[PDB]
Amino acid sequence: RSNESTSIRVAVEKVDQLINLVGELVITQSMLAQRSSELDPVNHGDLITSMGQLQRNARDLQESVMSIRMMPMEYVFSRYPRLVRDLAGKLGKQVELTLVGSSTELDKSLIERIIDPLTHLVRNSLDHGIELPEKRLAAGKNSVGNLILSAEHQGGNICIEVTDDGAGLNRERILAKAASQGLTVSENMSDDEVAMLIFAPGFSTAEQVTDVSGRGVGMDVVKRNIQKMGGHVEIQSKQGTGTTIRILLPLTLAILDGMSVRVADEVFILPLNAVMESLQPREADLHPLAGGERVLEVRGEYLPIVELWKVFNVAGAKTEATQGIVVILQSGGRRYALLVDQLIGQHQVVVKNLESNYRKVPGISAATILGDGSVALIVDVSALQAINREQ
Amino acid sequence: DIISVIDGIAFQTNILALNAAVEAARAGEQGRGFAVVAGEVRNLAQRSAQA
Amino acid sequence: DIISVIDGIAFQTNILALNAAVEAARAGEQGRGFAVVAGEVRNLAQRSAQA
Amino acid sequence: DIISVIDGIAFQTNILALNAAVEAARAGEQGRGFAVVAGEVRNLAQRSAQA
Amino acid sequence: DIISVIDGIAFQTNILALNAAVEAARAGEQGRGFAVVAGEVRNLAQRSAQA
Amino acid sequence: DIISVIDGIAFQTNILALNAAVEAARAGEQGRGFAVVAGEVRNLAQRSAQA
Amino acid sequence: SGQEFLVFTLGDEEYGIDILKVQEIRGYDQVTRIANTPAFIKGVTNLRGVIVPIVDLRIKFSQVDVDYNDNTVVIVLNLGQRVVGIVVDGVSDVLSLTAEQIRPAPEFAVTLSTEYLTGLGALGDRMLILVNIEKLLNSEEMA
Amino acid sequence: SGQEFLVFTLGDEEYGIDILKVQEIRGYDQVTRIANTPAFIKGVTNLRGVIVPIVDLRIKFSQVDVDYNDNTVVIVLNLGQRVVGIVVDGVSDVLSLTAEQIRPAPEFAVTLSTEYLTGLGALGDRMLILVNIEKLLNSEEMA
């Protein structure tokens, strides 16, 4: 007997209202915190000091409200045995489900939308993935399967993996189906990369989705729900080994970490997750390129140099890379450089959607506001990744 | 002519020293030392360039 | 001769205080208290040297 | 009038130099670094004030 | 001209020994082998510099 | 007479500086920092001695 | 190892306190007088949003000659139940008294009492009077 | 990096030893001549309250001339079981030989120095005669 406690019924609407109150609070203190840094430290001597203690307590209460709103993952894992132990006996197989990390929690709103996606993955493993006991012993594999549903925390995110030891996702079958619909593929892609190509419209672990799977939900629909929640998805499978599908879920989508770059008067911002390195290339690492462009040599690899002033048509920018600064970015595995005039530093600005009064423009994803009052345009890294390909 | 060269070399030293501070903070806790070191090296370049 | 000595003593104090600030930088948040004292000592060194 | 300021600043430097050593010894093994630097900086304050 | 070079070389030697001495006694009881050597080299650097 | 003393002080510096690399070899890659410092400090001792 | 203590000056005499109880050291700062309080208590001053009263140890001991200068220093403490500072004319030097250097309090009359004194710190030709600032500031008079 | 060594010059030739075994480098201090010992063993000295018998490697190989001016220095070793000293004309520098630079020992009818020749640091043009300091002082000629 360690320690006990009690609980009281609380309406979900009341708990959701807390996220709205603390939400604006975290967003309000973030804007005010930036103003105290830009202004002189005289009047803001003790204000900046108190902001540090509030900046941490502001998130502690936020994470506390969320944690109270989450629920253990065991409640979600308690529904998989219903489909594993039952379908195994109906089809004539032996599959034992294993649960790892039951102490993990997850938001209630996320549990009402991740059960069916994961339920579809388990259904495919018990039909196309895992084979019969006889076929498994023939290839030296154990008769009884081993489905594992792992889950754990990750700072401000939650990781959920669905490891399987079935027949594995075929490689030659995905390349033939992906190339038919018009998807860029190649033989250089390893078995883990080809597994990420099963997200095409109307397609899943098997070509027959609507015919086999009753519910009209597949990898294309699963990823759609993940985008609405702000998560990601990864697959690391291989033929004759197993299958694993990872699914991430965020917790707070109101602050974006990114450095503020300046390009002649106008100021922009670049995401921090995409920025790799930065330096000042000289004449000993700059070569021409077909089409009046240039490339940056980074440890032998010649990366494409994309001018940020050409996309926005900024007058008076540092056209020469020796005078300005070049930052190495990345989006979708491939890396690419970006030319700017002068840097500022890392600042956690608040995302501001521009579609509220107009619409998205090419080369920009979101915006925000600085301490003084000027608006800062957040450049889109996904758009710049497609410009170098056309060069 | 030498002052023009020192200004050019000092300018690159300030930009190069600035990138060290940015790359230092990118690592997080594994670059706190280079942050102040790089932040101070660039300061000397501005004084030398301004001088 | 004494002013020349105080100028050197004040200069050495800046070097010693400079290393203290660099040490607190590599330590991270575990040296903010010494950074304030180290920076303050450096300021007095400039005043003593300038004076 | 300036020596009176240098003498005063020299005394304040000794106080601030010892304040770092006080918090340094209280930190334990992590503070031994500042104790060595603070120890030498304190000696310069005495020589500066004595000068 | 040579004394001016020896003066700089003798002075730089004191800076390198200073950083090594501060890093030696930065933290940990195992900083004895580097603190003693760094301390002696730092002393000889000043004697050679003043000489 | 002073050059004879600087030659002796510079010679002793090579002895203490030489031991710095020996103590650093025990740490392996961790003591690689003192190896570079000891290597340069040992070289400066020869330059000051030969000079 | 021996017990460490923070020594400070108060005009002519010298006293000491435990270094563990000390938090930081900083120059004099403006305070706020409290309604109806003793004379040895200057006031309270803000520090990181916390009320840290300021007490003058030189006035508490009831001395004959009292002086004031711009070089006043205030040693911030961190007791197990309160956070009250102390004013000192100037820090002395940190020491590490051993079991032999820490002698009991005198037998004659002194400034404080036997309970408000930990012992005597011997260091060459400088006799230090160890003061138990912990129970002193947390005594019945201060509550 | 590879294994580190400490190369020292003995007039013309060069010999390398394990730098990890080297304790501290010193000069040619006074020693107590012991006529009972051979000729290649000068005497003993008192270092850290331990009798460190000094050895003259330049005499063991039967060289041309042996000097004892200020250029000569001593290297304090540390075999764990005892502390032995060796006289050297002058240390070169500290290096780090890799597996490719360290060459195997030669072959001949008589073992000769092969009892301790761990390898030959063939650093391009500069030849290094790596000798095991432990087996060297513990060989039949030294034991």
mmCIF file of N, CA and C in Angstrom, chain A residues 48 73 78 90 101 106 113 124 144 157 169 173 177 210 228 232-233 242 249 271 302 304 338 342 360 379-380 383:
data_model
loop_
_atom_site.group_PDB
_atom_site.id
_atom_site.type_symbol
_atom_site.label_atom_id
_atom_site.label_comp_id
_atom_site.label_asym_id
_atom_site.label_seq_id
_atom_site.Cartn_x
_atom_site.Cartn_y
_atom_site.Cartn_z
ATOM 1 N N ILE A 48 11.744 41.010 -16.938
ATOM 2 C CA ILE A 48 12.325 39.872 -17.645
ATOM 3 C C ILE A 48 12.637 38.743 -16.673
ATOM 4 N N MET A 73 -3.061 4.661 -22.043
ATOM 5 C CA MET A 73 -3.127 3.950 -23.314
ATOM 6 C C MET A 73 -3.696 2.546 -23.163
ATOM 7 N N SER A 78 -6.978 -2.087 -24.775
ATOM 8 C CA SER A 78 -7.915 -3.102 -24.312
ATOM 9 C C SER A 78 -8.924 -3.510 -25.378
ATOM 10 N N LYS A 90 -11.384 -17.385 -35.847
ATOM 11 C CA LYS A 90 -12.319 -17.487 -36.962
ATOM 12 C C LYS A 90 -11.601 -17.873 -38.249
ATOM 13 N N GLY A 101 4.585 -0.589 -22.573
ATOM 14 C CA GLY A 101 4.369 0.779 -22.147
ATOM 15 C C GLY A 101 2.904 1.107 -21.944
ATOM 16 N N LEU A 106 -2.773 9.567 -23.293
ATOM 17 C CA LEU A 106 -3.098 10.205 -24.561
ATOM 18 C C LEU A 106 -4.362 11.031 -24.386
ATOM 19 N N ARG A 113 -10.184 9.271 -32.369
ATOM 20 C CA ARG A 113 -9.862 9.296 -33.791
ATOM 21 C C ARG A 113 -8.682 8.416 -34.173
ATOM 22 N N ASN A 124 -5.321 -5.722 -41.109
ATOM 23 C CA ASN A 124 -4.538 -6.115 -42.276
ATOM 24 C C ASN A 124 -3.449 -7.111 -41.899
ATOM 25 N N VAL A 144 3.258 -19.362 -33.867
ATOM 26 C CA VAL A 144 2.483 -18.302 -33.233
ATOM 27 C C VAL A 144 3.087 -16.954 -33.601
ATOM 28 N N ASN A 157 5.414 15.475 -27.364
ATOM 29 C CA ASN A 157 4.769 14.616 -28.346
ATOM 30 C C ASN A 157 4.551 13.238 -27.736
ATOM 31 N N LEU A 169 5.961 -6.150 -45.806
ATOM 32 C CA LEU A 169 5.449 -5.411 -46.953
ATOM 33 C C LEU A 169 6.334 -5.676 -48.165
ATOM 34 N N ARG A 173 6.001 -5.081 -55.258
ATOM 35 C CA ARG A 173 4.577 -4.851 -55.469
ATOM 36 C C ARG A 173 4.197 -3.392 -55.254
ATOM 37 N N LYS A 177 2.775 -0.582 -58.283
ATOM 38 C CA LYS A 177 1.496 0.085 -58.067
ATOM 39 C C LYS A 177 1.671 1.593 -57.926
ATOM 40 N N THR A 210 -11.127 -1.774 -50.468
ATOM 41 C CA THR A 210 -12.579 -1.725 -50.345
ATOM 42 C C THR A 210 -13.208 -3.109 -50.405
ATOM 43 N N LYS A 228 -4.832 16.365 -39.717
ATOM 44 C CA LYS A 228 -5.764 17.209 -38.977
ATOM 45 C C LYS A 228 -5.339 17.370 -37.525
ATOM 46 N N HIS A 232 2.626 13.002 -37.422
ATOM 47 C CA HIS A 232 3.389 12.457 -38.535
ATOM 48 C C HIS A 232 3.150 10.953 -38.610
ATOM 49 N N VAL A 233 3.820 10.307 -39.559
ATOM 50 C CA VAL A 233 3.696 8.866 -39.754
ATOM 51 C C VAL A 233 4.973 8.358 -40.405
ATOM 52 N N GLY A 242 9.307 -8.287 -41.088
ATOM 53 C CA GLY A 242 8.199 -7.820 -40.282
ATOM 54 C C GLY A 242 7.631 -6.535 -40.838
ATOM 55 N N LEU A 249 1.848 12.228 -32.402
ATOM 56 C CA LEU A 249 0.742 13.115 -32.090
ATOM 57 C C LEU A 249 1.279 14.280 -31.268
ATOM 58 N N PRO A 271 11.775 28.233 -40.191
ATOM 59 C CA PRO A 271 11.633 27.206 -39.153
ATOM 60 C C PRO A 271 12.985 26.674 -38.704
ATOM 61 N N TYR A 302 27.603 18.983 -53.496
ATOM 62 C CA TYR A 302 27.294 20.312 -54.019
ATOM 63 C C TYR A 302 25.787 20.523 -53.914
ATOM 64 N N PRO A 304 22.247 22.842 -53.922
ATOM 65 C CA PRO A 304 21.785 23.990 -54.711
ATOM 66 C C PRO A 304 21.577 25.222 -53.845
ATOM 67 N N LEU A 338 20.016 28.343 -48.644
ATOM 68 C CA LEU A 338 19.178 29.526 -48.785
ATOM 69 C C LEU A 338 20.014 30.758 -48.483
ATOM 70 N N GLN A 342 21.231 39.089 -43.421
ATOM 71 C CA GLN A 342 21.739 39.077 -42.058
ATOM 72 C C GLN A 342 20.777 38.298 -41.174
ATOM 73 N N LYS A 360 -3.375 31.832 -48.851
ATOM 74 C CA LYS A 360 -1.960 31.489 -48.885
ATOM 75 C C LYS A 360 -1.324 31.975 -50.182
ATOM 76 N N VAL A 379 8.683 32.123 -44.030
ATOM 77 C CA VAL A 379 8.890 31.485 -45.323
ATOM 78 C C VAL A 379 8.608 29.991 -45.211
ATOM 79 N N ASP A 380 8.046 29.427 -46.277
ATOM 80 C CA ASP A 380 7.714 28.009 -46.323
ATOM 81 C C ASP A 380 8.912 27.234 -46.857
ATOM 82 N N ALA A 383 7.995 24.968 -50.088
ATOM 83 C CA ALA A 383 7.967 25.615 -51.395
ATOM 84 C C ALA A 383 9.374 25.773 -51.961
#
